[PDB]
Each structure stands twice: as C-alpha cells, then as structure tokens.
RNA sequence: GUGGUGGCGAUAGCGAGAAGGAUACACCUGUUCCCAUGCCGAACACAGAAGUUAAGCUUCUUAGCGCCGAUUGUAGUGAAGGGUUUCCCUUUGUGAGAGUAGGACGUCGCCACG
RNA sequence: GCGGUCGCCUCCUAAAAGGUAACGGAGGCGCCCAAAGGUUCCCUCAGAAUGGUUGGAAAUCAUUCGAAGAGUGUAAAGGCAGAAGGGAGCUUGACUGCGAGACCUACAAGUCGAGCAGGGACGAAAGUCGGGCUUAGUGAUCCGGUGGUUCCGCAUGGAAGGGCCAUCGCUCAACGGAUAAAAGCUACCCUGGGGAUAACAGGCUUAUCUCCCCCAAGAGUCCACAUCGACGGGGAGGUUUGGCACCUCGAUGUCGGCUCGUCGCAUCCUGGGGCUGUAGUCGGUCCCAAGGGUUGGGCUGUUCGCCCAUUAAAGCGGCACGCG
RNA sequence: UGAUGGAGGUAGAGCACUGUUUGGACUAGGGGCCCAUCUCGGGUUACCGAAUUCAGAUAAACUCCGAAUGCCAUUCAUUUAUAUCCGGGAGUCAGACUGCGAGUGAUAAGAUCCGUAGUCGAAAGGGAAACAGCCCAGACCACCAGCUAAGGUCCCAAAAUA
C-alpha cells in the first residue's frame, strides 16, 4: 500500500496523543481488531498482517483494512553527518492511535475470525484486542 | 470583609507573574503576613498564588 | 534547494478596540480586506485601515461573516 | 524592450517627468498632457 | 391592501403548493420621436394603454433543504501535582467541535395611494 | 574540503497578537502594462445536461441547471461576484508643492496617510483619481554624464570651476557595496591561538552490527516447531559501519609483532544432561558448565585470509582495538 | 489581579473546500469471446471501470467550525511602586541543563535548532549515597534557643521497630 500521489514529498513525523478521532467502532465487518496503544504502522506491517489473516480465512469472507499509510518517513544513509537538508522518503506509515479499528472481517464463523485476528495482531507492533460489531 | 494572607511557600523558581503578584500583595519574606480587603481583584490575586499562601478571615 | 524566506511584514491590528486614537493612526495591517473600513476609516493603497479622525476604535461584524473597523469621535 | 524615458515640456523645454515605455509597443515618442510646475499649467510633454 | 424606501447575522433564504390585481406594480402595444444593440426596440431609451394575472410581484400554506440552536457529556486546555515520562494520570478552573431538545417560512421604521 | 547558499517576495515550521532559528519543508523576483492606468456607464463566471452542417471529447449557437467550484499579467497567501473579474466611451491623477498623524525600526532605510494649495481627467451630480486586488520587480556613498537654475565666482567684470534641483551610468548578485585595478603551491616551511574544532582512545546514542527471542505460512513422504523456518514483530550486548563533539591540541604515541598476562561467557575441547527425522559408530539441536587446555609453519608490514602439516580442541570477545 | 470590549485560526474537532483514502450500489466508458464484419449491433466474464451516490477514514504547508491561554486596550476597580525622557560609565554578542511546545535526527544522543518557564552561569544551605543545571530554599552577623520546607524516622544516622 502506497498513496498514488502526495502533495508534499516530505512530511513531519508528527505526534500521537489521545484516542483516535474516528474509526473506533466496527463499520463493515462482523469482527475487528482494535489497537490498545498508539504507534506507527508501516505498509509492510499492514500487508503482512493482511496476508496472514486472509490465508487463515481460506479466502472465505471479507477483509477491510481501515487504516492506510498516508504519511511518509525519510531516513539518512549510514556514514552521513547531520545537516544538509532532510532525507529522501524511505517508507510509508499510518499513525495509529489507541482505539482505532485497524482491520475488520466478516463472512466467517466466530472461532475462525478470532484465530485469524490473532495471527494478524502478532504481525503488528501494537497491542490489540478483538472487538465484535454491535 | 478582610483576608489575612500569609506566604507559606518560597517564591524561588516561580513564574515572574506569580512573584509580581506576591509583591503586589505586599508580602516579603516567607511567613510574611498581610491583611487586605476581600475584593474581587484581591481574591483573584490570592487564587493566582493559591498554592503559595494561606488565607484567613 | 530550500532555505529562503521573506521578512515578516508585522501585519495585524495596531490599535485595540475601545482605544482612543488620533486622526490618521493605522488601525490594521493586512493583505486584502480581511477587515473592512467602517465609519471614519479609510483603506490605504495596500489595504491598511487607518482612522480618518480622532476617536475610539471599534471592531464590529459587517453582516454575517465580515468584520469592520469604525472610529467614533466623542 | 521596456526602457526608462523623460517627458520634456514642449513650451519650456523642461524635463519635468520620468517614466518608462515599451519601445516595440510604442515606437513613436510618447506624448502626454502633463502639468508643468514651472509654467504651473497643463502642457504637452514629449519624450526626448 | 398595495407601491416605494431603509435597519436588524437567512430565525429575513431556498424548494413546493395555493390565492390576487380595485388602485398600485407588472407583464403588455408600438419605434415618430431623444436614445441603442461589437447583429437584434431582446435589452437600454422613448411613446402608449387593446388584453392578462399566464409569469414576475404581493399575500398565504408547508420544516423538504438551507439557517439559528439550549442543556448534558466528552476532546482540548490555564494553574497546581504525580507516574513506570516519545506518553499517561490526579486536583482545580475553562470548555469546544460533533450530536441533539428545540427555534424559525422574519421582524423594526418612514413615505404615497387606499 | 567537495556540493549548496549569500539581496528581495509568499506559504508552512511559528506553539489562535507581533516576532521567532536550523545546510528545516515548499515556491517565486531582478519584471510587465500606453492599457493590463484614471473615470462614467454597463455586464457576470467555470462546468454539466439537452438539441443542433461541416464538427470530431472538445471550435461557434440555444434553453436549463448552475455562489463561484471561474477570473484576477506574473509565485504563494490573504482578498475580491455590491466586484478588485469582464466590455465600452472619454482620458493621462503612472499629476506639481507637500503632508497632521501613524506603522516598522539599532542606524540607514522601509510602509500607510486623511488633509491643504496649484492645475487637471472623468461624471449631470455626488464624487473618484498622487498607477496596476494586495504583498517581490532592487543597490548607500564616492566619481562621472545630461538638463534646468534670480546661487557662488579668490583685486574688479567675465571666465574656468563649483553649488542647488531633476535624472542617467551597478549580475558593486559575496546584493550595508574593502581597492579604479588581483590567481595559485608549500611535504622546505614558520609564528600566534583552540580541545571554541577534526584524526587515536574515552564518554553519550545504538540506526547499523553481533547475539537472543515472539507469531508460524511453509520445507521436512505424513508431520509448523528432530532440523530449517518466509512475510512480519520484540529485545539484549556495546566487539562492527556510524552519529554527536563532552575531557585531552602550554602533546592522552598511532597498525602489526614480541614479553606478560587477566577478565566475560554468547563454550572450540574436555565434564553433566534433554529432544532427535537418536538401531550401533557417528551426529544434529538445545540446557548446565569458565576448572584447565585451546599449534608449528609457507605468503604477505600486516590484522584478516588462503595454504601445508598436526590436535581432544586449534573458541569469541573486553581490558586506552590491554601492554612503546 | 479583577471587570468589560476586542484582534487572531493554534489545541481539539470536522469533511463544507483541497489533497490522501477504504468498502458497497449503479454506471458512462474500456477490455478479449462468438455471431455479423462495411466491424457492424449484440451478449458475455460477479473482466477493468471514470462520474454519481451510500457508508468510513485522513492532513504542518485542508477548514463548515473552534477553545483554554497569551495579547492589545479602558480617564474602570483593588493592591502595589515603579514606568518614561535627558545625560556620565560600562560589561555582554561561546551559554548549560531541567520541565513543557515544535523542527532537524531514527518520535537516537549529555545531539542540534527555535519558542516558553525555571535553575546554574553569578547561589552558599537541606534532600537526591557522591552528583553546576533536578526537589526545598536565597547566607549582613552572634547564640550549646524554638517552628517548619523538600526529604525522612531499624543500625551506620537526627527522628515511628507509629
Ligand atoms: K501485537
Ligand atoms: K416594449
Ligand atoms: K401573476
Ligand atoms: K424559512
Ligand atoms: K477604461
Ligand atoms: K560581502
Ligand atoms: K614535496
Ligand atoms: K588509544
Ligand atoms: K540495543
Ligand atoms: K532474548
Ligand atoms: K512431527
Ligand atoms: K591533542
Ligand atoms: K546431545
Ligand atoms: K573453562
Ligand atoms: K610470517
Ligand atoms: K613475510
Ligand atoms: K584476551
Ligand atoms: K619506544
Ligand atoms: K474532505
Ligand atoms: K492545522
Ligand atoms: K544609561
Ligand atoms: K528549553
Ligand atoms: Mg512571511
Ligand atoms: Mg499600489
Ligand atoms: Mg455546540
Ligand atoms: Mg503569529
Ligand atoms: Mg502565540
Ligand atoms: Mg485588473
Ligand atoms: Mg574675479
Ligand atoms: Mg584672480
Ligand atoms: Mg552583506
Ligand atoms: Mg619530496
Ligand atoms: Mg605552533
Ligand atoms: Mg588551552
Ligand atoms: Mg569539545
Ligand atoms: Mg581519555
Ligand atoms: Mg554544542
Ligand atoms: Mg601539561
Ligand atoms: Mg551458558
Ligand atoms: Mg623460505
Ligand atoms: Mg592498543
Ligand atoms: Mg606504557
Ligand atoms: Mg489537530
Ligand atoms: Mg546540548
Ligand atoms: Mg562566564
Ligand atoms: Mg547549591
Ligand atoms: Mg563551580
Ligand atoms: Mg518539630
Ligand atoms: Mg536514631
Ligand atoms: Mg513496624
Ligand atoms: Zn513647461
């Protein structure tokens, strides 16, 4: 996952404080994975979690990725001193704040869903918990 | 009516506005006491430095 | 390459509401008409709002979503 | 090509005004009715 | 009642529907006249009063949209403190946005004809 | 050092006044316009649908829908549909002498300005006009050129030459401009300073690096976990490649070797043990264990590495990459 | 310090604009298959699918909104005692750390660069074992007097084996 276009190549790291503004409830799926901490999440982590969840589900049911890695983070190569401008964009992240429902799943029985979400959570860096649609 | 304000906490390390408020009330050394009218302005000053003083009637 | 920036133009209000000012005092510096010239107030060549006469400054709203400066002599 | 120029008063030959014109757009000498402070009245000023 | 003309944040609006022209206002009849169209008397200008409320306009119904919007709670936050201190928590004061109860199909003047 | 930058304008950083840095993130300027200025009058956009010769997605035309989603010379922000956008007529206020008072400000400068007078443009009048929707489009002084001038004129009259006013000559762009005029080598070097500032070692940090793990898609005939384990996740260590510049520049000697060792254990051998895809002999993996031992040469300054020949084994690291 | 009035778009939040973005509905349209080819019209992939719409996110350089604070001001109020202006004499232009808000960095550094408050600098004393910058607190002096702050009370070691 990578945005097709960006208004600005380089972006602030930002700060993550408090609960997520929105997306704290399950919208489409029957079950969801809620972040209990705040952390950056990379497109790689999102993709790894998504693949794990789908593989276990056996292409049964539907999977929604609520988060998207809009933000870009840069880096400086080894052996490069401080200064001389910002680094080149290295990767893409989604700042996820606690309470966000990162993934949703439907069309699968409850026990399969719980195991699938468990695998996805182990791939992600944040501590998580399973949430049922209300 | 009246307020007896006594400075129970040192002003060292405090914001300039709080130091100025204590001075405006007219308190000097620690445990220095003063008597003032219970006006809205005076009670406002006391509230500004409420953590540094004790107020009696 | 970045690293350029123009000098700040010290825009904004130069007189407070309810303040007495002399004729010709600058009330508000701006780009475009963020606030409009009201009574006894002129707008300079570069959108600066100034008092045409002595009086007290008053910022009001011009209708629903626009502002206005007036100078009222006493 | 835009160039600075001087408008001289025809009546008194006084170089009262400075301005600029685009030569290509205005090949001919510019002429304006401008106030001549020396004569204190409007006169024809021609570029020189 | 209508026509001019203003004040007030659209609570004056928009949408939909209904009624009226007695006067008034309009459409409306014309281009000889002043005047006019980068062509057109469509418009602007002028002259004039056969017809019509059809439209505009006026009055009225409507909460569909737009607009206004209390209280409660919450986010943030000044001040004073704490913790396991990229953050989080407590006391105190302040307190949104959102979402709602609701409000509202205007009101305050002056003139002229009735 | 190389590269980049140097003045000016706009935005974000900037923490709801103003201001506010970084070799922070984005862009622009060194002009253009005789109308793209002034004024009087007049007008309202972009797109979409429907219909329509050439004509096509899209040329021009018509109706409706359309509040700005257009335009505003030129970057961006702010602003403008009572227009600052668009069109027409007339014009030259893109005026002269100023200017109460303000903003900005170390100075020099910079910005705004009602209003007074002179003489005008437009308009019936009100009234507007000292350029352009606003904010860049610029350069001190010295020196010199051109024009004007009721100023001065070394005994006097002239003159020569100055003054004053107006204006021209700057990529003085290192843009408050050293001079009218200027590039290099030094390991033959020297002096005054600095740990304000680099190279060695120390310190902080741990991205990287080494090691240890979590999840388990898989490989393993079957069988995730004997063994290996993708996509991902989390740590420890302070031996690597690095970052910072805190001690040392009135001196902390730098590789390798030799002599002497000592310590850590993430154990190379030996000892104990579990699991095994352990028949036995061999092993693999993991657990405990630092008592002792852990090589002699060829090549290269070498460390490292390759090779020869051995050994139970030929461990990995720290100690100023121990030890001048 | 209070009361009152203001200017401003941050925190937060929001999607009304602009970017980024998820899923669903529908679909212009585009894809190859065959019939028909003058390539003319289909009928197709739950083929790819703009626009619209529904639902859901996201933003330093987005805003329909919008604080707390701070700021400007008042012939205002209470308390306080400084503010200007003129002149003589300076020194300073290496700052450090801590807390809070940002950037750079890797949301590393006792890193770097700003904003804001404090301390050190130029501050002795008590606490943090020792420990400029943290916590409490500002030494004119004498005392073999007393009350407290931070921090403490079993022994070193003053005070609860409360
Ligand atoms: K996790
Ligand atoms: K007519
Ligand atoms: K009608
Ligand atoms: K209404
Ligand atoms: K014109
Ligand atoms: K220079
Ligand atoms: K040499
Ligand atoms: K060393
Ligand atoms: K580490
Ligand atoms: K471990
Ligand atoms: K098995
Ligand atoms: K040295
Ligand atoms: K074994
Ligand atoms: K051993
Ligand atoms: K050798
Ligand atoms: K050798
Ligand atoms: K050793
Ligand atoms: K030696
Ligand atoms: K939006
Ligand atoms: K913002
Ligand atoms: K002085
Ligand atoms: K600080
Ligand atoms: Mg600026
Ligand atoms: Mg101008
Ligand atoms: Mg509300
Ligand atoms: Mg500001
Ligand atoms: Mg501020
Ligand atoms: Mg224009
Ligand atoms: Mg003579
Ligand atoms: Mg002589
Ligand atoms: Mg310079
Ligand atoms: Mg030689
Ligand atoms: Mg020397
Ligand atoms: Mg020295
Ligand atoms: Mg140093
Ligand atoms: Mg040392
Ligand atoms: Mg430093
Ligand atoms: Mg010495
Ligand atoms: Mg061990
Ligand atoms: Mg030999
Ligand atoms: Mg050594
Ligand atoms: Mg030695
Ligand atoms: Mg925010
Ligand atoms: Mg530092
Ligand atoms: Mg010093
Ligand atoms: Mg001390
Ligand atoms: Mg000392
Ligand atoms: Mg006691
Ligand atoms: Mg004791
Ligand atoms: Mg006890
Ligand atoms: Zn003349």
Alpha-carbon span A62 to A68, nearest angstrom: 17
Alpha-carbon span A28 to C16, nearest angstrom: 54
Residue C44 backbone phi and psi in degrees, to 5:
-75, -175
Alpha-carbon span C73 to C54, nearest angstrom: 6
In Å, how far are A58, B13, B47 from B16, measured between CA atoms? 67, 9, 16
Length of chain D measured in residues: 48
Residue C57 backbone phi and psi in degrees, to 5:
-85, 140
Alpha-carbon span A11 to C38, nearest angstrom: 43
- Residue B25 and residue B5 in contact, taking contact as beta carbons nearer than 8 Å: yes
- Residue A105 and residue A63 in contact, taking contact as beta carbons nearer than 8 Å: yes
> Concatenated DSSP letters for B2-56?
EEEEEE-S--TT--HHHHHHHHHHT--STT-EEEEE--HHHHHHHHHTGGGEEEE
Surrounding residues of ion ligand 1, Cβ less than 5 A: A 121, 124
Give the torsion sign (CA, B20, B23, B28, B34): negative
CB neighbour class for A41 (10 Å; exposed up to 12, middle 13-18, buried from 19) = buried
Q: How far is the CA of A35 from the C1' of F209 (A)?
A: 32
Give the CA diameter of chain D: 33
- Residue C56 and residue C18 in contact, taking contact as beta carbons nearer than 8 Å: yes
Edge-to-edge strands of the sheet including C49-51? C12-13, C26-29, C49-51, C41-43
Q: Is D17 helix (H, G, I), strand (E, B) or coil?
A: strand
Q: Is C47 helix (H, G, I), strand (E, B) or coil?
A: coil
- Find which nucleotide's C1' atom is closest to A10's CA: F25
Alpha-carbon span A118 to A33, nearest angstrom: 9
Centre of ligand 49 to C-alpha A86, Å, is 61
This structure was determined by cryo-EM
- Find which nucleotide's C1' atom is closest to C63's CA: E9
Which tokens hold the place of B16?
């300039």
Q: Considering only CA atoms, which of A10, A113, A14, A7 is closest in space to residue A60?
A: A113
- Find which nucleotide's C1' atom is closest to C54's CA: F101
């Amino acid at each position: 996952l990578v945005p097709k276009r960006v208004k600005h190549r380089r972006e602030f790291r930002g700060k993550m404080r408090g609960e997520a503004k929105g997306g704290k409830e399950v919208a489409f799926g029957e079950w969801g994975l809620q972040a209990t901490e705040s952390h950056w999440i990379t497109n790689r982590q999102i993709e790894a979690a998504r693949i794990a969840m789908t593989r276990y589900m056996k292409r049964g049911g539907k999977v929604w990725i609520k988060i998207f890695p809009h933000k870009s983070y840069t880096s400086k190569a080894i052996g490069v001193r401080m200064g001389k401008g910002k680094g080149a964009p290295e990767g893409w992240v989604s700042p996820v704040k606690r309470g966000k429902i990162m993934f949703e799943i439907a069309g699968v029985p409850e026990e399969v869903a719980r195991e699938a979400l468990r695998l996805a959570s182990h791939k992600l860096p944040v501590k998580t918990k399973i949430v049922k649609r209300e | 009516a009246e307020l007896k304000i006594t400075l129970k906490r040192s002003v060292i390390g405090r914001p300039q506005n709080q130091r100025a408020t204590v001075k405006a009330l007219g308190l000097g050394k620690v445990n220095s006491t003063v008597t003032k009218p219970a006006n809205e302005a005076i009670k406002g000053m006391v509230n500004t430095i409420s953590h540094l003083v004790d107020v009696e009637e | 390459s970045n690293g350029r920036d123009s000098e700040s133009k010290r825009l904004g209000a130069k007189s407070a509401d309810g303040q007495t000012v002399t004729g010709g005092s600058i009330l508000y510096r701006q780009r475009g008409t963020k606030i409009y010239p009201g009574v006894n107030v002129g707008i300079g060549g570069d959108d600066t709002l100034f008092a045409k006469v002595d009086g007290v400054v008053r910022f009001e709203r011009k209708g629903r979503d626009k502002k206005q400066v007036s100078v009222y002599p006493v | 090509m835009r160039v600075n120029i001087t408008l001289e008063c025809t009546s008194c030959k006084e170089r009262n005004y400075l301005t600029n014109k685009n030569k290509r757009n205005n090949p001919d000498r510019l002429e304006k009715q401008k106030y001549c402070p020396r004569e204190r009245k409007v006169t024809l000023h021609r570029e020189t």
